[PDB]
Each structure stands twice: as C-alpha cells, then as structure tokens.
Design a protein around this ligand. Structure first.
Ligand code: HEM
Lengths: 499, 499, 499, 499
C-alpha cells in the first residue's frame, strides 16, 4: 500500500465498481465504435478524413494547453472555508465579517514565483498564497504571499523585476548578473532579500508558512468611517523550513513535494488551517507614521500595532480535476466587497488593473463564467453582454442599456466608495530614496540570532558569487548600508568563493 | 400597439412587474454604488485606476465581438423539435428515427452566404438552412442549403469561389469581374447559377423556402446493410418569393426583413414547419447511375427516385438572447450518429474537416461546451482534457488514457462504420468535365415555363453586364452550351446593356 | 470601359504583362502540382489526409476572419501626408509641428458607427475620421469624428449608449425604444442629437465632411508652458450632404458608396485634402469659461476662440490590400508624442485605456508590430518582450530589465509630462445636469435657418415615432427645454405620425 | 572570467560601447520621461488612468506568455546549414539534394518529451531532434527524435500515451500506475521502452545523440520513380550518455544542462555536426519485407539495408532571442518539397494534420509569417488572404480566386505527387498484434552486452516498482514474451523492491 495520491485511480475505480462504464463518444455525443485503429483503405493504406473520430480527438489534444501564468506558474490548489471567530464589525461592514461563526467557502492556490510549470517546489523563492472568498456581496480575492513585504514599491518596476528573476532573453538561462544588477541598483529590495535568504526562504511545504496581504488596505464600517489595515493569516501547523541540503535533494527526488504534501494532508484528515489577524491604523496615525504607511517595503511593527484576531481559514477538500479547478483559478485584487477598499499604495494600484487584464488573455474575456471563478453566491446582473465563450443565458432579453425605463438592474447607493481628499501636483514622485535600511537593521540585529545571521550571509554569498565583481561590490555596499557586519561577512565569504 | 418584435422590452418589463430590480454588480459580483459617474480627483480632475468599476465594464465591452462566420455571417435562428411520422428503420438505425411519434429537439439557423453581419436579408443569394438534432446518440447536424446542388464539386475550389463572391482584396468592393471570371472558367456552376438567378434566389423570408442536404449521405440499418440517400425538408407554408423590385425596396427599408419575419411568426403562434423526405439509391443503383451519384452539381430525378416521407420539423420557440443561442451556434457535418454516415462526395469530405476547424478558431477549442452547442441528451465520456475555457469538472479525476485497467469509458463495437471496398490509384482525378449541361437543359426547358425563362435571363444579364466583354463572351458560350436560345436571350440583353 | 475601382484586376494584370506568373505554393513554400482536384483513392473514392495541399489551404480559409471593430466597424481607408503651413511652436513642441513645410506620413480611416461590416455607408450616423501621424517621436493617433461633440460626457455610459444604438439582445433587430429611452433619460445628448438629425447627418462621401478631435487636449511648448486646444480639420472640398430621399436609394443601389467614392477620387488624381486648425484656451481662460471646458457635449465658440491654422492633410494613395492596411489599422488616443497631452475630460480619460485594450483582443497582444500600426519612423527600444506573434528579432539579447549596468535603453528627461495641481475629494461627481440646452438653443436659432429647422424636426419625428408614447413625451419635453417651438414642432409631427 | 553563456549581457554591452543608448519609448514609439515612477495625485496619492506609460508596458507584460508545446515543451535551439556530400539524385529530385556542395540554411530544435517548460534536461525520456530546411522549393521539416522507433503505431493512441506520460488529472502528479498500465496493456511499446531504459535514455546533452526520421518516407526522382527510405543523422561528436547517478545530480544542480552545453559549444567555435544517411527499400522489397515496412515500431536491419550517406548537418550559430527564434519555431512534417513524400505509416499520417492544427492554436493562424517559420528561401504566392496578425502586403491587390483570367499564380504540373495503387476494404484494421517481440529479442540478446542488460532491467525495476502489483505482473509478462531471462531479471528486482 502507498500514499493516497498514488492510489487516485485505484480509488476512482473502487468508488465506481457498482456501475457499468460509460459509452465513449465524440465531442458531439456520437458513440465510438473503435478508437484504437484508424479508418484506412486497406491494412497498410493511407488515412481518410472520413475518420472524424480521430480528427475530433486529435484537434482537441492539439489545443489542450493554455498560457501559463506570467508569474506564479507552478501552483497547488485546495478548497475549504473561512469561519469568523471574533468581532471586527466596528471596522468593516463586509458581509464576510457579519457575525461570529459566519462561514464562507474559500479557494486557495499556493505557488512559487519564478519557476515555470515543470520546475521544482523546494527552491528559494517567495510563495504565493492567494485566497478567494465567495461572499454574498461578490467574490473577495486576497492575493497574498508568504511575506508581508516585497522587493519594490512602484508597479512600473515590476515587469523589470520579473524579467530579472527569470531567464536570459538569448540563452534562456537563469542569469545571476540579471538578479543582482537589479537588486544592487534598487536597494529598496534590501528588506525582502533579507527575508528571502533566511530559513523561511524554503518552507517545508505550504502548510507550515504564514500568509500576508502585505498591502495596506482600507476597511469601512456601517457609519462610513474608515481605517487602514494589514492582513496576517498565520499557520496553525507551525513554521517549519527545509535546509539547503534537504531542499536540494527533494528538488530532483520529488519536484512536486509541496503538491503531494497538501493533497495527502487533506486526504488523511489533517486539515491545515490559518488564523486571520488584522492590524489597524487610523487615518490620524497614518499621517504621523514615520515611514510611508503605503510603502510595500515597510511593516507596521507589532508593539505599536498589535494583531487583532478575526477568523480561521481551513482547507478540507482537494480538487477533483486540477486543470478545471486550479489552473483556471483567477484572483483579482480588484474584486473587493463593500466594507473593504484599496489604499493609495502604488504597488496595489497597479495590481488593480494587471490581474483582470492578464486573465482575459490567459483564460479568456469571460473567464468569470468558469465555475471556480464564478461568484456563485451572488446574483450577477448588469449590462455586460456577449464576448467569446458566453456560457449562461447571457442575461436573456433583459434591457442591455442603463438607465432604462424598463426596470433592468439598478445601482445600490449604499455601496458607494469612501470619499478621501487628496491634494498635490499630478506628477511622477521619486520614491527610490525612502528609508531602505532601518527596518532591515532591526530584522538583522533583533529578530535573527547569531546562527541565523550566519546562514543568511552564506545563502546570499552562495548565490551572489556568480555575479561580476562590480555587481558584488555594489550589493555588498548596500548590505553595509544596513549593518557594517552584515556586509563585511558577505564580503568575507565572497573573497573565498572568488578563490 | 406594434408588432411583437418591437415590444420585446415592454414584454420583459411586464413579465417582471412584480419583483424588484436586481443589484447591479461587477463581473465579480461586487455591488456598485454609482455607475453613471467615474472616480476622479475633483469635479474636473482626471480619472483614477481605483475605478475598477469602470475598468471591469469597459474591458468586457472591449471584448464583446468574436469573429463572424467566414461564410453565412448574417443569420436568423429559432428552436423546436422533430417528430417522426413514417417508418424508415429499414434503411437507418439512427435513434432519431427509432419509432413513429418520437420527438427530438432541434436548433435551426437561416442565413445568406456572401454578406457580412450588416448585409440586407432580401438579396439574391443561397440560403443556409442548418438543422441540429439533439439525439441520445449525440448531436446530428444536417447542414444544408435551400438548394439541392452547389456551384462546384471539389472542395479545393471552395476558398476561391467564396473569395470571388465577396470583396475585392484592394478596393473592398463587390467585383463582378471576380464573380463571373470564376463562374465562366468553371462551367460546373451552370446548374446552380441557373437556380440562383431564377425566382427562388430571393425567398420571401425563411418560412417560404425548402431545405436540402444536397450531399449524398449513407444510411445504415441494424443488420449492417447500407444505402445512399438525399435529404429534402419541404416548406409546409408554400414556396413564395420576392420580386426584384420588392426585394430592393426592402433591402433599405428593412435590412432585417427575414430575421423579423421569423420572430413575429413564432411569437404570434404561427409556427412554421417542414416535411422531411429522403431519396434512396441502392449500391447497385449507384454503379449504373448515368452521372456521378456523389456529384454535388447533380440531383436525383424524382421520376426514378421518388420522395419517401420521414417526419416533421417544427419551429415553435424564439431565442431569448441572440448572441448566446444563435451567433454561437456551431454545426458540424461530421456530427453523425450511428446509422448516418458520409458518402465519398468530394465536397462533403472537405466539410468533415472545415467546420470543427473553423469553430475552434471562431468560438474556441472547447466550443462544444457552450450550452447551445452541447450534446445535452447524451453522455460525453472520453479521454479529452483541458483546453481554454473548460466549463464542467473536466471529467473529474477519471483516468485520462486509453486503454486502462481502471474502468474508464469503453468503446461500443456496434457503433463501427459500414465497410466499403475501394480500388484505384491514389491521385488527383479531374472532375472539371463531368456533364455540366444535361441537368440544366432539363431545368431550363422542362421545369421553367415561358415567363420564368424570360426573367431568368434578365436577372443574369442585369448582373453579368458589369463584367468585361471577354468575361461576358465566355459566360454566354457556357449558356449557349446548355441551350442555344439560353445564350441568345442573354446575349441579346447584353448587346443592349452595353449601349 | 468603367470606373477605376471596377478595373482593379484589369490593371493588376496589365502592370504584370511583362513577367511570368509566380509558382503557386503551399504556405510553406512547397510548389503545388495541382490545386483543382483533391487526392482521392480512385475517381469516386474518399479524400485522404495525405492531401496536405487541401488541409493547408482550407485551414487558413477557416481562420480568415477576425473580430470586427466593436464600434465603427464599416470603414474606408487611405494614406497620404500632413504638411505644416503655419508656425505654432510657441504652443506645442511636438516634432510634427517643428517648422513650416515639414511633412509627416499619415493613415486615415473613415467609418460609420453602428452598422456592422456589411451595413451601408449612406445612413444617418456620425462618421469616424481617424488620423495616424507617423512622427519621429512615435505615432500620434488623432481619433476624431465628423462633429466637435458627442452624446455623453462620462465614459461609464459609453457601453450603454452603444448597446442602445445596436441590436436588441433577443431579436437582434434595431430597436427604436432602446434608442430614445436612453437619449430621453440622458438629455445631455440633446446637443449632438440635434447635430445628427440635421443636414450633416448623412454626408456625401467622406471627402465632403469636416473632422474634429472633439476633445480638449493639452499642448506644451519647449519652456514647459501649457495651454488647452481643440483640433478642427475642415474639408477643402466643401460641405456637401445627401437628402434623405437619395441616401435611401443609394443604401441599396450602392451600400459601399463612400468606399467607392474615396478610391475613385484618389485613383483619378482628385486627391481630397483638409485644413488643420486649432483653438487655444489658456489655463486661466479655462477657470472662467462659463461651462466645463472639458465637457464633451460643448464647443468653444468661434468669436471667443478663433481658428488658428496649422497645416494640410492630403490623401493621395489608396491601400493596396484592404485587410492588411485598413482592417488592421489601430488608432490609440493614448499614442501622443511630447508636446501633446490629454486634458482631464472624463471621456478622453476612458479612451486612454479602451483602445489599446480592445486592440489586443481584436488584433492581438503584439498588434503594434503589424506594418501599418508600427511607428516605422521612430526607433522602438524598451524592456517589453515576447507575446504571441513576435515578428522581429525581439530586440535581441538586449538586457531585458531596467535599470541595468549594461547600457540598455535609457529614459529621456525632457519627455516628462506637464505637472498640474489638482485638489478635491476622490469621489464620483455627478455631471448629468451640466447645462444641456444652452448651446443647443444657439444652434437651433442662430445657426440653422427656417428650412433647416423644418427638416431637423421632420427627421427627428420620422424616427422617434416608432418608440412608445411615454418615450415620445419624454423626448419632446427635452426638446421643449431647448426651445418651446423645438418640441412643439416635433409634437405636431408626432401627432400625425400617430394617426 | 566565466563561461560564454553567463557573460551574455557583458558581451552585449561590449559590442555597443561605441554608440549611445537608445531612447526608451512606448510601444507606439513615444519617448517616456520617467518610467521608474507612476503618475499620481501627490506623492502618496492614487494612480491615474492617463498614466498611459504604465498601462502600455504592463498590458504587454500581462500578455507575454503563449501556450507551451503540448509535447516537447522543454527545448533548445541553434541554426546552421546542411551540405550535400554524396549524390542521391537517382532517388530524389528534391532541390536540397541537387548537387554535391549545395548548402541550405537549417534550424534545429532539441527537446525532451514529457516535461513542461521548467523541467530539467537530464531526465529519462526520448529526445526531440527537429530540423527545418529552407529550400528553394519551400521549407522541408524533418521532425525526428533520437530513436528510430516509437511506442505505438496508431495515431488514435497518441493523445492517450501522452496523457499517461504526464500528470494525473486530479493530483497533477506523475502517476506510475498511468505510465505502466498503458505500456503493459499495449505491448507494441516493448521495442521503444527497451531503448528508453537503456544507456541512451539519458544523453549527455544534445551534441552526443543521433537523430532519426523513424517513419518510412517516399523519395521520387526526376523520372517519377519512387522508393521508400529512412533518415538517420548520426552525431559526429560520438554517442555519450549520463549515468543515473550523475543525471540526477544535474537535475537539481543545472536544470538547463543540455541548453547550456549547446550554447557554450557554438559560442566557442566547437560547432557540432551530424552525418545524414538514408536507407532505401524498393517497392518490391516492401511487399516481401517480414514485418509491416510502415510499422513505426520496426527498424530496417542494417545488414539487409545499409546506410547511404547524403550530407552533413552543422550548427554554427546560436539564437539571438530565444523566444522569437526557438519558442516560436514551428515544424510541420507536412512541409515536404517535391521529391519527398509520406508513406502509408499510420503514425505519420496523423502528424500530417496534427502539427499545422496545433500551430494555428499555439501561435496563431498566420504562424508561417513569423520570421523563423517563413520559407524565406522561396516565394510564397497563392490565394490565401487575411487572418489574425497579417504581417506583409497580404499579397496586395492580386486576384484572390482561382482559376482566373488575370494572370495570378499558376500551378506547376511537375510538382504533382507520385501515384500508388491501393485496394481493400475501407475500415479500421487491428494492428495491435503485429510482431511485438522479434526485433526486441534481437536488441536484448545481440545488441546489448552483459553489463547493459543488467542496467536495463534495473532501470526498469526502479520505476516499475511504484506501480500496483497487477500492473507489474502484466508488464513482466510482456518482457517474458521477449525473453524469459528478460522478465526473470526484472521480476527478481521487483521482488526486492516490494520488501
Ligand atoms: C504591481 C505589482 C504586481 C504585478 C503587476 C503583478 C502581476 C501579476 C500577474 C499578471 C499575475 C498572474 C495572475 C494570473 O495569471 O492569474 C500574478 C500572480 C500572482 N501574484 Fe503578482 N504582481 C504584483 C505583485 C504582487 C504582490 C504584491 C503580491 C502579494 C502581496 C503578488 C502575489 C501574486 C500571487 C499569489 C499570484 C498567483 C495568483 C494565482 O494563484 O493565480 N504579486 N501577479
């Protein structure tokens, strides 16, 4: 006997032994007489187009694939529910927080960042942790990572960052000179790079890491009052990491380690769960906050802004078909129910457009009619019509223009957005010299003990050594600008690695 | 009060007069507060990206259109059923003919040929008359015209012919030179060209015209015995045409005459219906048939092959949304249940490839998952997975390879194709010189009377006069080769038209 | 002989009389021995798959069509040049205005609005007049109409307006109820609706109508100083209109009237040309302007802001292939070179996104690499890579991230935008009741004469009569709000039209 | 200093040191002023829509990815030439074999089979060895692997096989039950499974393995006489294979080993080259050949059919951009010039459709106008027009129909195909029971020595142990059918692996 994942077909058969197999048909439902031998004129003769059974099957095989995600391509998927445990209605009027005990079906997709579809799971990289809440007020997508921060704070640099993390445009190889020349030219990446090369850069699966909204969001209560918040959902299974040596063995031993881990866990009853906290920051506090409260390279410290518990995320169901239920998942940070709203964070502002845009390209214009993406607990009604692969009644004969004297849908005034005042020159403001070291200094000195610092500089050195010397010198200087010992320890290891 | 097509919204409001209007939501189901005014900074300021309400609607609007059909773009639709009235089980085992009284749902599309999505309905052209049967043995698509014959009898000429009948590649205008230079260089079009320019080239709507499969098809019964057959579905409302004078007036007074006529008839309960007939030709009749019995430019004379009734087609239901239920309709001649098989007709052999092919482009690789395209009265079980816009569970976690020892769907031996013997060189045989006149001489002399021959010639000269003299001179010869007086009458009207 | 357009093929043969015809190949360049007969086993045998000559040609015929434009689908195109005749460098620094006598290649496409690809040209509708300037500083797409104004002044109402102006979602018929219920619930359309139903609603071909940018734009000279502007290009051939009687006749006699008139004009040397003008409004004039200077239902009166001539637009070349050079043309209002910037107009702000978005859907992600869409007079260099249908070297092995220490493209500081100060609440401001009648009153009384007011009301009642009485009464009220005689005349005509 | 592949950007800067960096522009050619900061209202404000620089770039980033090859996704590319070195003009009239010394540009792509884009290169799997010849007679694609044979012999089993070799539809994991349940149930895979699991299952990169056409192909000379032939292109660098121990180390130390090995060789002048041979079988020898001479699981022994040299394949140029020149490479076995034709091989017959079909989806309808896919050594002329992303004149105003009296391209009679006589019932012949053991017994006994047989069984046991017992017992039987000692050795090791 083996693990549950290996016995998938065995159990699909046992769960069916009481029936007769189905008739094998064509896309059009036409039963097939023989689907092992093609229609030819004579045993050793050529093929006939009269063999549509072949053309119907081959033509579909030729179109099985779709474009993989531009980032976070390698992913795992599961399904569960979110249950409310405390009361934060004073901050948010979102239906998903209405009363204690409220359950909401969720869908979750873990993922790496840079690897393509076939890459390994146990590698140094951030981890995606997108969560989709199916509320009565529409879908709420919390597209979070395993880290509360990122490498940059402007969306215009994001394509550049991804291009620097992926393959060379001529050799198609992972290029160290592309990784560090970018990081060393943008020191604001110092904070997230220190997280990434720590022990938590390679989690022991998806069940032993936290998730974070990272972005500052906005919560609105029933009175129309607003506060800024962060989202933290911590693992109830405890932080656990893989060492460089073990993570490298599993890289070729089991490229799908975290995929097999998640599936076998839920199958054997071990339902992983996460505890959803929030930090809150009033509008007044945001004005005096030392750093920019909407800078994605900054955290709200815990001592000044403690964690407030909200509810639990539980995963208790596997997918039945991976492609239909995981590959075709689409999380839009633009999907936000009343009571939740975005902050002026430049990074989140770009994500408001990027995700719906790429989905219409990767999946299709009407990707929201795919089952797992549908807001199936909300009544979708508007004046949108047509588009490729329209799957419902297309809202039937309802008037397709607004306004109209024929009682088509109506706007709901209570769903208006919070009104905030802004004044200033419409202009591209230079955010490259916002504090790039302070919070990193605290992490290096006060969060990491001595052993962890030691492993931090060995992981960085082990990867930075491949770059050219002038890139090493620039990166080390940026590490010196955090702590003189931080840099000089990296430099020491580099002096050795350079023979 | 007006016709019921104009009172569509008025009736939609009335059927909703009780309940309240719905909550207008984004595609993600999030209710919108205000969708008549955009999110700006000040009353006269710029637009924000935060306005995801604007983005979500505009983006879908930007993606409303799909590629129209490469032919038969202007279309009218309706739905209904097919009821068997006579027993033809001795020729065919297709479940759709199982017993008298059995009903099978149908979906029909009426169309022109050459015009685009905005062309008038009352123009001189063939009429599409495609019928989709939803049988338990899958969908059966009888994709026929309002003519038993076509202009050509080899598929390789089809892209050419259609190019000739559409717009010049430079001027993007209807070019008579392109029209007649092809018809005159390929006199096989004589037969269908004679049909086209007579009185039935412009039918008074879609309810006053016949429908034919034109192709020779093969029927197979329960013993395995096979015969060839034609399909005729004759209008029970009576052949009724439009004059050239009335057709031109309606071309600008009501570009959507046929579309409106159909809708109003069904709405007021005046349901149109047709009577399906078949001709039967034994295998030994096909060897002695004076012409090529699979020639698409030929018919089977009624005297030697009478009409055998089968059942009734009845259209009693209008579309609720035109785009979802008619524009996305996909007919594949290769959708054939056991009991109905293709003949060696060179044209039909090509249509087995082109319709599923063009549909993967127009609609999508998984277009058979669109509700109106689905075979929703059969069980579609097979080893095809994935593809963009997968809309069911994608067959779950069923084994996806064949053969397997895990009890996935099996092949049904009874559904094997009837077996014919062929012998001959594999080469490109020349069919340009099959009798191109005989069956036209019969139509011109024995079917048409004095007045109908006169109008036939006038309609030809009224359009052939715009072609160069060398193209006219050749076309006239082909008409003289049918019957001398045929070319003389045409040439006598061209001598005048050329001043 | 005939007109030049009809003789398109005759002239293509003559221009090649000296050469031998080319060898006919597959798409892969493989010569074809025969393409009139299909590969079959024996003269009356089935078609083979070996016949790759058929599949290669048929597969591309099955994929010839693309989605038509979601608006302005029916169109006509030509090419030429823009020449500067007057100095306006004090206002703008755009290299297209640098010095008198400078020429810039242009590509123009005229169009209607609602009709699909097959509709007629001579119908009552606005007329598109897009102009693509190929500047050294990139393309400049002036996507104007044949009117200075529009029906709405907020982009969120644009999908709705279009839906109303197109076909009912159930009947697929032009619906007067949808037209006037919208126009009557949004009386800001009074201005443009009065333009549409006057004599200039149906121009005589595309050469006898003006072109306007419509939107307020911004110009920026070298010193950083900025003003607001309007772009008026007036026909050098004179305003000329078709009567309702003659527009209906041509609608069926020559649906492609405009298309044929443009081609024949250019082919006979009679090149149409326009005179580009601008208005100018200082930032201070904007602050006191009685109306909202960025309202798209408003014009800047001539007496207060007189026309300033700039240059000449001349169309002196016909497209060689229509699809490649006209159907695939893509104008992006967002394509603006330094010196030309957008105003805060709510509608223009929505057009900066809409056009590239839909062009990626209609043509493809890399649509800008199509020859006619390329900025083939600028050197495109940046960090964008890959995509479907990549056609060049993809900028080679250039560093694909930014910033970088390997001398890849750099930013040009002089090309920064003009900086404006805005202040106000971020909310959805209601503009529905901006003055809706004033400049319509002036138009009805001062601009039209007695005869023209008579025809304006006859055209309005002739089409409004088909709508429901409650919609009639509402629209007449809106017309009464412009001038009591305006609505009283329309009502007197509706009384008769209602028997 | 490092290897050439990692110094790619270093060399790109050096080859440009003389000139100054280009001006960074939008896609429309517009210079940007600042692309590191986004346009906002105040330094901590929201993002604007008129930031068309951000949207322009992001929208293209959102559309970087296309569907990966449904099989052979992981690949590496290089370019060179083919040079004739022996005269085989008595067999084939193909222009690529015209005379000794004739050179023809080529394009090659190496690949694995099952892994996705991100998988490792040094894994047990067949290898793709595709070659594209740019001949005057169009393009000739010899889409070959590194094996003369394949697992199956009927294309109706191909999508199945690939499904089993890839990921389970639910867990998305490699499934040893799917692998061997397919292989055990189809014993025709014995010949190739033995090849797969021998030392040549893992080659030391792409420069040390052979290439084969596998299929039987037809050659036709200038007189019209035909013969059947095989293509072998052996490596001039010598066969070299990785051990299971090292292959696994390199799977996590350098996932891209094969790609790096290729690029470094070319860049350093050590150009790899292959020697093309052919085997020849007359039509008479094909009637008496022991097995089916078109059975893809069968080779032609060298004693009865010796290799006949032809020429050399040389790779001397790396790609400049991987995506444009390798990811967009499309090989169609149907691309065959006069002198080379397909045989009745049931597997090749399916490919004649599958590759053009999938390319029109993966890349698009006009994928042949992509540079690297263009037959740029030939002159494409035909009556195919339009399509998404039409990139040249679209053949201008040339007549788009055929036949035509306007001197458009003509057919070349000499390019007609060879004519072969076929006779027999048109039906689906059962090929499951063609000799599945005779040629494998020769390989096991006579080709391999004592050591290799030992490692062959071990390699098989290591992977077969993971499958269920009832699949092991059946697989072992198929190996006992080849040789008792073959099945014995495997069973003895499976007895140990099952504890
Ligand atoms: C402006 C900055 C960013 C841009 C433009 C961007 C863009 C994208 C795009 C286009 C995708 C592909 C989505 C799909 O194909 O369905 C994606 C995936 C993803 N991104 Fe980002 N990203 C940004 C930053 C971030 C941030 C800040 C986070 C977390 C806080 C994040 C987490 C993720 C995750 C988890 C996924 C995978 C979602 C899934 O499972 O489908 N990204 N991103």
């Amino acid at each position: 006997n083996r693990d549950p994942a290996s016995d998938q077909m065995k159990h699909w058969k046992e769960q069916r032994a009481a029936q007769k197999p189905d008739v094998l048909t064509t896309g059009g439902g036409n039963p097939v007489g023989d689907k092992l031998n093609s229609l030819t004129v004579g045993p050793r003769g050529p093929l006939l187009v009269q063999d549509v059974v072949f053309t119907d099957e081959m033509a579909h095989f030729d179109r099985e694939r779709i474009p993989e995600r531009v980032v976070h391509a390698k992913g795992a998927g599961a399904f569960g529910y979110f249950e409310v445990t405390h009361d934060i209605t004073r901050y948010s009027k979102a239906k998903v927080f209405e009363h204690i005990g409220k359950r909401t079906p969720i869908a979750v997709r873990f993922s790496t960042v840079a690897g393509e579809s076939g890459s390994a799971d146990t590698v140094r990289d951030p981890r995606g942790f997108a969560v989709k809440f199916y509320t009565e007020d529409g879908n709420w997508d919390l597209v979070g990572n395993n880290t509360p921060i990122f490498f940059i704070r402007d969306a215009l640099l994001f394509p550049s960052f991804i291009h620097s993390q992926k393959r060379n445009p001529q050799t198609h190889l992972k290029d160290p000179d592309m990784v560090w020349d970018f990081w060393s030219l943008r020191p604001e990446s110092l904070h997230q790079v220190s997280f990434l090369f720590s022990d938590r850069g390679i989690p022991d699966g998806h069940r032993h890491m936290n998730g974070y909204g990272s972005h500052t969001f906005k919560l609105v209560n029933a009175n129309g009052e607003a506060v800024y918040c962060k989202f933290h959902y911590k693992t109830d299974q405890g932080i656990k990491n893989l060492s460089v040596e073990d993570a490298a063995r599993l890289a070729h031993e089991d490229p799908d380690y975290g995929l097999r881990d998640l599936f076998n866990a839920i199958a054997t009853g071990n339902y992983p769960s996460w505890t959803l906290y929030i930090q809150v920051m009033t509008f007044s506090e945001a004005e005096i906050f030392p750093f920019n409260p909407f800078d994605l390279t900054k955290v709200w410290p815990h001592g000044d802004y403690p964690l407030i518990p909200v509810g639990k995320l539980v995963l208790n169901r596997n997918p039945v078909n991976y492609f239909a239920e995981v590959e075709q998942l689409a999380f839009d940070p633009s999907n936000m129910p009343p009571g939740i709203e975005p902050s002026p964070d430049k990074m989140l502002q770009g994500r408001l457009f990027a995700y719906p845009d790429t989905h219409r390209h990767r999946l299709g214009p009407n990707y929201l009619q795919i089952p797992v993406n549908c807001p199936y607990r909300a009544r979708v009604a508007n004046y949108q019509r047509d588009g490729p692969m329209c799957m419902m009644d297309n809202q039937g004969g309802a008037p397709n223009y607004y306004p109209n004297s024929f009682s088509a849908p109506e706007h709901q005034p209570s769903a208006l957005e919070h009104r905030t005042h802004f004044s200033g020159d419409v202009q591209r403001f230079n955010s490259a010299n916002d504090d790039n070291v302070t919070q990193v200094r605290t992490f290096y000195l006060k969060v990491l003990n001595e052993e962890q610092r030691k492993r931090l500089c060995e992981n960085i050195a082990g990867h930075l050594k491949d770059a050219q010397l002038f890139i090493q010198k620039k990166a080390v200087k940026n590490f010196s600008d955090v702590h003189p010992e931080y840099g000089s320890r990296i430099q020491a290891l580099l002096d050795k690695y350079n023979e």
